[PDB]
Design an enzyme around this catalytic site. Sequence first.
Site, PDB file in Angstrom:
ATOM      1  N   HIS A   1      48.796 -66.666 -50.329  1.00  0.00           N
ATOM      2  CA  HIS A   1      47.321 -66.804 -49.858  1.00  0.00           C
ATOM      3  C   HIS A   1      46.506 -67.107 -50.950  1.00  0.00           C
ATOM      4  CE1 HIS A   1      47.200 -62.589 -50.625  1.00  0.00           C
ATOM      5  NE2 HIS A   1      46.122 -62.907 -51.221  1.00  0.00           N
TER       6      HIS A   1
ATOM      7  N   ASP B   1      53.890 -64.216 -46.567  1.00  0.00           N
ATOM      8  CA  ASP B   1      53.269 -64.470 -47.784  1.00  0.00           C
ATOM      9  C   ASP B   1      53.837 -64.370 -49.009  1.00  0.00           C
ATOM     10  OD1 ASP B   1      50.732 -64.617 -48.825  1.00  0.00           O
ATOM     11  OD2 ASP B   1      49.845 -62.518 -48.519  1.00  0.00           O
TER      12      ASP B   1
ATOM     13  N   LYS C   1      51.153 -48.027 -36.197  1.00  0.00           N
ATOM     14  CA  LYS C   1      50.365 -47.426 -35.427  1.00  0.00           C
ATOM     15  C   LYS C   1      48.881 -47.472 -36.382  1.00  0.00           C
ATOM     16  CE  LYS C   1      53.491 -43.321 -34.981  1.00  0.00           C
ATOM     17  NZ  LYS C   1      54.121 -43.803 -33.606  1.00  0.00           N
ATOM     18  N   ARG C   2      48.960 -47.559 -37.683  1.00  0.00           N
ATOM     19  CA  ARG C   2      47.603 -47.612 -38.335  1.00  0.00           C
ATOM     20  C   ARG C   2      47.038 -49.217 -38.304  1.00  0.00           C
ATOM     21  NH1 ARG C   2      48.021 -42.843 -37.898  1.00  0.00           N
ATOM     22  NH2 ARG C   2      49.441 -41.551 -39.229  1.00  0.00           N
ATOM     23  N   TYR C   3      47.741 -50.174 -37.829  1.00  0.00           N
ATOM     24  CA  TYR C   3      47.039 -51.447 -37.500  1.00  0.00           C
ATOM     25  C   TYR C   3      47.172 -52.099 -36.103  1.00  0.00           C
ATOM     26  CZ  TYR C   3      46.147 -51.785 -42.582  1.00  0.00           C
ATOM     27  OH  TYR C   3      45.568 -51.551 -43.661  1.00  0.00           O
TER      28      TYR C   3
ATOM     29  N   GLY D   1      41.570 -58.956 -56.165  1.00  0.00           N
ATOM     30  CA  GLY D   1      42.212 -59.358 -57.213  1.00  0.00           C
ATOM     31  C   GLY D   1      43.533 -59.093 -57.588  1.00  0.00           C
TER      32      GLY D   1
ATOM     33  N   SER E   1      45.842 -59.123 -55.380  1.00  0.00           N
ATOM     34  CA  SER E   1      46.965 -59.884 -54.471  1.00  0.00           C
ATOM     35  C   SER E   1      47.799 -60.848 -55.278  1.00  0.00           C
ATOM     36  CB  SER E   1      46.387 -60.511 -53.296  1.00  0.00           C
ATOM     37  OG  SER E   1      45.709 -61.698 -53.792  1.00  0.00           O
ATOM     38  N   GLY E   2      49.054 -60.669 -54.628  1.00  0.00           N
ATOM     39  CA  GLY E   2      50.308 -61.505 -55.682  1.00  0.00           C
ATOM     40  C   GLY E   2      50.955 -60.721 -56.548  1.00  0.00           C
TER      41      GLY E   2
HETATM   42  C1  4GR Z   1      35.749 -63.497 -62.557  1.00  0.00           C
HETATM   43  O1  4GR Z   1      36.835 -63.798 -61.774  1.00  0.00           O
HETATM   44  C2  4GR Z   1      36.954 -63.018 -60.517  1.00  0.00           C
HETATM   45  O2  4GR Z   1      36.176 -62.643 -60.147  1.00  0.00           O
HETATM   46  N1  4GR Z   1      38.107 -63.424 -59.724  1.00  0.00           N
HETATM   47  C3  4GR Z   1      38.457 -62.844 -58.545  1.00  0.00           C
HETATM   48  C4  4GR Z   1      39.806 -63.203 -58.123  1.00  0.00           C
HETATM   49  C5  4GR Z   1      40.162 -62.870 -56.788  1.00  0.00           C
HETATM   50  C6  4GR Z   1      39.263 -62.137 -55.956  1.00  0.00           C
HETATM   51  C7  4GR Z   1      39.881 -61.793 -54.655  1.00  0.00           C
HETATM   52  N2  4GR Z   1      41.015 -61.799 -54.324  1.00  0.00           N
HETATM   53  C8  4GR Z   1      41.299 -61.402 -53.099  1.00  0.00           C
HETATM   54  C9  4GR Z   1      42.492 -61.527 -52.350  1.00  0.00           C
HETATM   55  C10 4GR Z   1      42.420 -62.649 -51.321  1.00  0.00           C
HETATM   56  C11 4GR Z   1      42.274 -63.879 -51.953  1.00  0.00           C
HETATM   57  C12 4GR Z   1      43.094 -64.347 -53.212  1.00  0.00           C
HETATM   58  C13 4GR Z   1      42.716 -65.677 -53.654  1.00  0.00           C
HETATM   59  C14 4GR Z   1      41.615 -66.247 -53.434  1.00  0.00           C
HETATM   60  C15 4GR Z   1      40.807 -65.965 -52.380  1.00  0.00           C
HETATM   61  C16 4GR Z   1      41.105 -64.690 -51.893  1.00  0.00           C
HETATM   62  N3  4GR Z   1      42.936 -60.234 -51.809  1.00  0.00           N
HETATM   63  C17 4GR Z   1      43.164 -59.388 -52.618  1.00  0.00           C
HETATM   64  O3  4GR Z   1      43.353 -59.453 -53.959  1.00  0.00           O
HETATM   65  C18 4GR Z   1      43.804 -58.182 -52.021  1.00  0.00           C
HETATM   66  C19 4GR Z   1      43.661 -57.389 -50.869  1.00  0.00           C
HETATM   67  C20 4GR Z   1      44.103 -56.304 -50.410  1.00  0.00           C
HETATM   68  C21 4GR Z   1      45.453 -55.960 -50.498  1.00  0.00           C
HETATM   69  C22 4GR Z   1      45.967 -54.800 -50.082  1.00  0.00           C
HETATM   70 CL1  4GR Z   1      47.712 -54.546 -50.315  1.00  0.00          CL
HETATM   71  C23 4GR Z   1      45.240 -53.893 -49.525  1.00  0.00           C
HETATM   72  C24 4GR Z   1      44.049 -54.055 -49.310  1.00  0.00           C
HETATM   73  C25 4GR Z   1      43.342 -55.361 -49.648  1.00  0.00           C
HETATM   74  N4  4GR Z   1      42.075 -55.648 -49.344  1.00  0.00           N
HETATM   75  C26 4GR Z   1      41.050 -55.540 -48.353  1.00  0.00           C
HETATM   76  N5  4GR Z   1      40.031 -55.743 -48.915  1.00  0.00           N
HETATM   77  N6  4GR Z   1      40.072 -56.091 -50.146  1.00  0.00           N
HETATM   78  N7  4GR Z   1      41.233 -55.803 -50.555  1.00  0.00           N
HETATM   79  N8  4GR Z   1      39.992 -61.314 -52.436  1.00  0.00           N
HETATM   80  C27 4GR Z   1      39.000 -61.402 -53.466  1.00  0.00           C
HETATM   81 CL2  4GR Z   1      37.654 -61.346 -53.387  1.00  0.00          CL
HETATM   82  C28 4GR Z   1      38.081 -61.450 -56.426  1.00  0.00           C
HETATM   83  C29 4GR Z   1      37.578 -62.070 -58.139  1.00  0.00           C
END
Ligand code: 4GR
Length: 238
Positions: free
Chosen positions: A44, A93, A160-162, A186, A188-189
Amino acid sequence: IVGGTASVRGEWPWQVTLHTTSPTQRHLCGGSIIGNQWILTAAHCFYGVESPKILRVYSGILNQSEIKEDTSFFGVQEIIIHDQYKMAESGYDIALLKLETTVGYGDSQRPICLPSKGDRNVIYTDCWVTGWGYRKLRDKIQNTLQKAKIPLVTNEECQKRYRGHKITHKMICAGYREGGKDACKGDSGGPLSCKHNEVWHLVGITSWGEGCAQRERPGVYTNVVEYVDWILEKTQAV
Ligand SMILES: COC(=O)Nc1ccc(-c2[nH]c([C@H](Cc3ccccc3)NC(=O)/C=C/c3cc(Cl)ccc3-n3cnnn3)nc2Cl)cc1
Protein backbone atom coordinates in the site's frame (compact mmCIF):
# COMPACT_ATOMS: atom_id res chain seq x y z
CA ILE A 1 4.41 4.11 17.14
CA VAL A 2 1.94 4.88 19.97
CA GLY A 3 3.08 4.22 23.57
CA GLY A 4 6.60 3.29 22.54
CA THR A 5 10.10 4.39 23.61
CA ALA A 6 13.26 5.48 21.79
CA SER A 7 15.30 2.68 20.29
CA VAL A 8 19.07 2.50 20.85
CA ARG A 9 21.40 2.71 17.80
CA GLY A 10 21.89 -0.73 16.21
CA GLU A 11 18.93 -2.29 18.07
CA TRP A 12 16.85 -3.00 14.87
CA PRO A 13 19.55 -3.17 12.15
CA TRP A 14 17.15 -4.61 9.51
CA GLN A 15 14.88 -1.52 9.84
CA VAL A 16 15.03 0.93 6.93
CA THR A 17 13.35 4.25 6.20
CA LEU A 18 12.02 4.50 2.64
CA HIS A 19 11.88 8.06 1.35
CA THR A 20 10.17 9.48 -1.70
CA THR A 21 11.76 12.59 -3.43
CA SER A 22 8.42 13.62 -5.13
CA PRO A 23 7.31 16.42 -4.76
CA THR A 24 9.92 17.00 -1.96
CA GLN A 25 11.98 14.44 0.00
CA ARG A 26 10.24 12.88 2.98
CA HIS A 27 9.89 9.58 4.84
CA LEU A 28 7.24 7.42 3.16
CA CYS A 29 7.27 4.00 4.89
CA GLY A 30 9.33 1.54 6.93
CA GLY A 31 10.85 -1.64 5.49
CA SER A 32 13.12 -4.53 6.47
CA ILE A 33 16.39 -5.77 4.96
CA ILE A 34 15.87 -9.46 4.10
CA GLY A 35 18.75 -9.92 1.63
CA ASN A 36 21.74 -8.00 0.30
CA GLN A 37 19.69 -6.31 -2.43
CA TRP A 38 16.20 -6.82 -0.98
CA ILE A 39 13.79 -4.82 1.20
CA LEU A 40 10.47 -6.30 2.31
CA THR A 41 7.70 -3.71 2.87
CA ALA A 42 3.93 -3.14 2.38
CA ALA A 43 2.34 -2.89 -1.08
CA HIS A 44 0.00 0.00 0.00
CA CYS A 45 3.10 2.29 0.44
CA PHE A 46 3.33 2.58 -3.34
CA TYR A 47 -0.12 4.08 -3.99
CA GLY A 48 0.44 6.59 -6.83
CA VAL A 49 4.25 5.83 -7.03
CA GLU A 50 4.69 5.64 -10.79
CA SER A 51 8.42 4.88 -10.82
CA PRO A 52 11.16 3.44 -8.51
CA LYS A 53 13.32 6.47 -9.57
CA ILE A 54 11.71 8.65 -6.88
CA LEU A 55 12.65 6.22 -4.03
CA ARG A 56 15.59 6.24 -1.63
CA VAL A 57 16.28 3.54 0.92
CA TYR A 58 18.26 4.57 4.04
CA SER A 59 19.70 1.87 6.29
CA GLY A 60 21.68 2.16 9.52
CA ILE A 61 19.54 5.11 10.59
CA LEU A 62 18.43 5.81 14.16
CA ASN A 63 17.45 9.50 13.75
CA GLN A 64 15.76 11.01 10.69
CA SER A 65 18.07 14.09 11.27
CA GLU A 66 21.02 11.85 10.08
CA ILE A 67 19.49 12.20 6.56
CA LYS A 68 20.67 15.23 4.54
CA GLU A 69 21.50 15.69 0.81
CA ASP A 70 25.00 14.21 1.43
CA THR A 71 23.71 10.99 3.20
CA SER A 72 24.32 7.74 1.28
CA PHE A 73 21.22 5.74 0.32
CA PHE A 74 20.27 2.77 -1.91
CA GLY A 75 18.42 3.44 -5.13
CA VAL A 76 15.56 1.10 -6.07
CA GLN A 77 15.88 -0.87 -9.33
CA GLU A 78 12.43 -2.48 -9.12
CA ILE A 79 9.20 -2.43 -7.04
CA ILE A 80 7.56 -5.91 -6.90
CA ILE A 81 3.98 -5.82 -5.58
CA HIS A 82 2.13 -9.09 -4.90
CA ASP A 83 -0.09 -9.44 -7.97
CA GLN A 84 -3.18 -10.39 -5.85
CA TYR A 85 -2.90 -7.10 -3.91
CA LYS A 86 -5.89 -4.73 -4.20
CA MET A 87 -5.84 -2.93 -0.80
CA ALA A 88 -4.37 -3.33 2.70
CA GLU A 89 -7.71 -4.35 4.25
CA SER A 90 -8.08 -7.27 1.76
CA GLY A 91 -4.58 -8.73 2.31
CA TYR A 92 -1.59 -9.55 0.06
CA ASP A 93 -0.13 -6.27 1.43
CA ILE A 94 3.45 -7.13 0.61
CA ALA A 95 6.08 -5.78 -1.71
CA LEU A 96 9.76 -6.20 -2.42
CA LEU A 97 12.22 -3.51 -3.40
CA LYS A 98 15.16 -4.71 -5.47
CA LEU A 99 18.05 -2.37 -4.71
CA GLU A 100 20.37 -0.93 -7.40
CA THR A 101 23.47 -1.83 -5.34
CA THR A 102 24.36 -4.38 -2.63
CA VAL A 103 23.99 -3.65 1.12
CA GLY A 104 27.28 -4.31 2.94
CA TYR A 105 26.35 -6.03 6.22
CA GLY A 106 27.77 -4.87 9.53
CA ASP A 107 26.77 -3.96 13.09
CA SER A 108 24.54 -1.06 11.81
CA GLN A 109 22.70 -2.90 8.99
CA ARG A 110 22.00 -6.58 8.49
CA PRO A 111 19.07 -8.80 7.41
CA ILE A 112 16.35 -10.25 9.58
CA CYS A 113 15.57 -14.01 9.13
CA LEU A 114 12.24 -14.87 7.58
CA PRO A 115 10.05 -17.29 9.62
CA SER A 116 10.47 -21.02 8.99
CA LYS A 117 7.52 -22.97 7.43
CA GLY A 118 7.90 -25.42 10.35
CA ASP A 119 7.54 -22.45 12.74
CA ARG A 120 3.93 -21.72 11.55
CA ASN A 121 2.90 -23.49 14.84
CA VAL A 122 5.36 -21.69 17.24
CA ILE A 123 3.96 -19.24 19.85
CA TYR A 124 5.88 -15.96 19.77
CA THR A 125 5.89 -14.12 23.12
CA ASP A 126 8.56 -11.45 22.50
CA CYS A 127 7.24 -9.27 19.59
CA TRP A 128 8.08 -5.67 18.84
CA VAL A 129 6.83 -3.08 16.35
CA THR A 130 9.22 -0.30 15.30
CA GLY A 131 9.12 2.83 13.22
CA TRP A 132 9.29 6.63 12.89
CA GLY A 133 5.50 6.99 12.72
CA TYR A 134 3.10 9.24 14.63
CA ARG A 135 2.58 8.86 18.39
CA LYS A 136 -1.18 9.62 17.93
CA LEU A 137 -3.65 10.16 15.03
CA ARG A 138 -2.80 13.85 14.51
CA ASP A 139 0.97 14.06 14.90
CA LYS A 140 4.17 14.07 12.85
CA ILE A 141 6.99 11.69 11.88
CA GLN A 142 9.32 11.15 14.86
CA ASN A 143 13.03 11.86 14.65
CA THR A 144 14.12 8.81 16.73
CA LEU A 145 13.12 5.25 15.75
CA GLN A 146 10.53 4.06 18.33
CA LYS A 147 9.77 0.56 19.58
CA ALA A 148 6.82 -1.04 21.40
CA LYS A 149 6.43 -4.57 22.71
CA ILE A 150 3.00 -5.96 21.71
CA PRO A 151 1.33 -9.36 22.20
CA LEU A 152 0.13 -11.40 19.19
CA VAL A 153 -3.65 -11.91 19.04
CA THR A 154 -5.24 -15.13 17.59
CA ASN A 155 -7.05 -14.96 14.22
CA GLU A 156 -10.36 -15.79 16.05
CA GLU A 157 -9.95 -12.91 18.52
CA CYS A 158 -8.85 -10.48 15.76
CA GLN A 159 -11.90 -11.42 13.65
CA LYS A 160 -14.21 -10.62 16.66
CA ARG A 161 -12.49 -7.19 16.86
CA TYR A 162 -13.03 -6.39 13.17
CA ARG A 163 -16.69 -7.11 12.49
CA GLY A 164 -17.33 -6.32 8.84
CA HIS A 165 -13.79 -7.24 7.71
CA LYS A 166 -12.50 -10.63 6.68
CA ILE A 167 -9.41 -11.32 8.83
CA THR A 168 -7.64 -14.17 6.98
CA HIS A 169 -4.78 -16.42 8.09
CA LYS A 170 -2.56 -14.36 5.67
CA MET A 171 -2.95 -11.59 8.33
CA ILE A 172 -1.56 -11.59 11.89
CA CYS A 173 -2.87 -9.27 14.59
CA ALA A 174 -1.15 -7.70 17.57
CA GLY A 175 -2.14 -5.40 20.38
CA TYR A 176 -3.35 -5.20 23.98
CA ARG A 177 -7.07 -5.63 24.66
CA GLU A 178 -7.07 -2.27 26.50
CA GLY A 179 -5.11 -0.59 23.67
CA GLY A 180 -2.24 1.82 24.31
CA LYS A 181 0.62 0.41 22.15
CA ASP A 182 0.46 0.06 18.37
CA ALA A 183 1.81 1.15 15.05
CA CYS A 184 0.48 4.44 13.63
CA LYS A 185 0.78 6.63 10.46
CA GLY A 186 4.31 6.44 9.02
CA ASP A 187 5.01 2.97 10.51
CA SER A 188 3.50 0.92 7.70
CA GLY A 189 5.80 -1.39 5.78
CA GLY A 190 8.01 -1.70 8.86
CA PRO A 191 8.67 -4.98 10.72
CA LEU A 192 6.84 -6.82 13.49
CA SER A 193 10.01 -8.58 14.81
CA CYS A 194 9.75 -11.59 17.16
CA LYS A 195 12.63 -13.17 19.11
CA HIS A 196 12.47 -16.99 19.31
CA ASN A 197 15.38 -19.27 20.47
CA GLU A 198 17.62 -16.10 20.64
CA VAL A 199 17.02 -15.34 16.87
CA TRP A 200 14.87 -12.47 15.54
CA HIS A 201 12.30 -13.38 12.88
CA LEU A 202 10.27 -11.09 10.63
CA VAL A 203 6.79 -12.21 11.63
CA GLY A 204 4.70 -9.34 10.32
CA ILE A 205 4.66 -6.31 8.07
CA THR A 206 2.81 -3.27 9.55
CA SER A 207 -0.34 -2.93 7.45
CA TRP A 208 -3.52 -1.36 8.85
CA GLY A 209 -5.84 -0.86 11.83
CA GLU A 210 -8.94 1.10 12.85
CA GLY A 211 -7.35 4.20 14.42
CA CYS A 212 -4.19 3.83 16.54
CA ALA A 213 -3.81 1.78 19.74
CA GLN A 214 -7.55 1.86 20.46
CA ARG A 215 -9.06 -0.58 22.96
CA GLU A 216 -10.09 -3.86 21.21
CA ARG A 217 -8.65 -2.74 17.81
CA PRO A 218 -5.37 -4.62 17.36
CA GLY A 219 -2.97 -3.69 14.56
CA VAL A 220 -3.21 -5.90 11.46
CA TYR A 221 0.00 -7.15 9.91
CA THR A 222 0.86 -9.12 6.79
CA ASN A 223 1.57 -12.69 8.11
CA VAL A 224 5.07 -13.14 6.61
CA VAL A 225 5.26 -16.96 7.17
CA GLU A 226 2.37 -17.32 4.60
CA TYR A 227 4.47 -15.48 1.97
CA VAL A 228 7.87 -17.18 2.32
CA ASP A 229 7.32 -19.10 -0.98
CA TRP A 230 6.33 -15.86 -2.73
CA ILE A 231 9.42 -14.04 -1.39
CA LEU A 232 11.72 -16.90 -2.55
CA GLU A 233 10.00 -16.96 -5.94
CA LYS A 234 10.80 -13.27 -6.45
CA THR A 235 14.25 -13.11 -4.81
CA GLN A 236 15.60 -16.52 -6.01
CA ALA A 237 14.36 -16.33 -9.63
CA VAL A 238 16.69 -18.21 -12.07
C1 4GR B 1 7.55 14.54 6.64
O1 4GR B 1 7.14 13.22 6.13
C2 4GR B 1 5.92 12.79 6.51
O2 4GR B 1 5.14 13.44 7.16
N1 4GR B 1 5.73 11.51 6.06
C3 4GR B 1 4.60 10.67 6.30
C4 4GR B 1 4.65 9.41 5.68
C5 4GR B 1 3.59 8.54 5.79
C6 4GR B 1 2.47 8.86 6.56
C7 4GR B 1 1.34 7.93 6.63
N2 4GR B 1 1.52 6.59 6.46
C8 4GR B 1 0.30 6.01 6.50
C9 4GR B 1 0.11 4.55 6.21
C10 4GR B 1 -0.74 4.37 4.95
C11 4GR B 1 -0.04 5.06 3.78
C12 4GR B 1 1.24 4.67 3.38
C13 4GR B 1 1.95 5.40 2.41
C14 4GR B 1 1.38 6.51 1.84
C15 4GR B 1 0.10 6.90 2.22
C16 4GR B 1 -0.61 6.18 3.18
N3 4GR B 1 -0.44 3.85 7.39
C17 4GR B 1 0.44 3.55 8.41
O3 4GR B 1 1.60 3.96 8.41
C18 4GR B 1 -0.07 2.75 9.54
C19 4GR B 1 -1.32 2.36 9.74
C20 4GR B 1 -1.73 1.52 10.87
C21 4GR B 1 -1.10 0.27 11.04
C22 4GR B 1 -1.44 -0.54 12.11
CL1 4GR B 1 -0.71 -2.12 12.27
C23 4GR B 1 -2.38 -0.14 13.04
C24 4GR B 1 -3.03 1.09 12.86
C25 4GR B 1 -2.74 1.89 11.76
N4 4GR B 1 -3.44 3.12 11.57
C26 4GR B 1 -4.69 3.58 11.62
N5 4GR B 1 -4.70 4.88 11.58
N6 4GR B 1 -3.40 5.25 11.57
N7 4GR B 1 -2.63 4.21 11.57
N8 4GR B 1 -0.67 6.89 6.72
C27 4GR B 1 -0.01 8.07 6.78
CL2 4GR B 1 -0.88 9.54 7.01
C28 4GR B 1 2.43 10.10 7.21
C29 4GR B 1 3.48 11.01 7.06
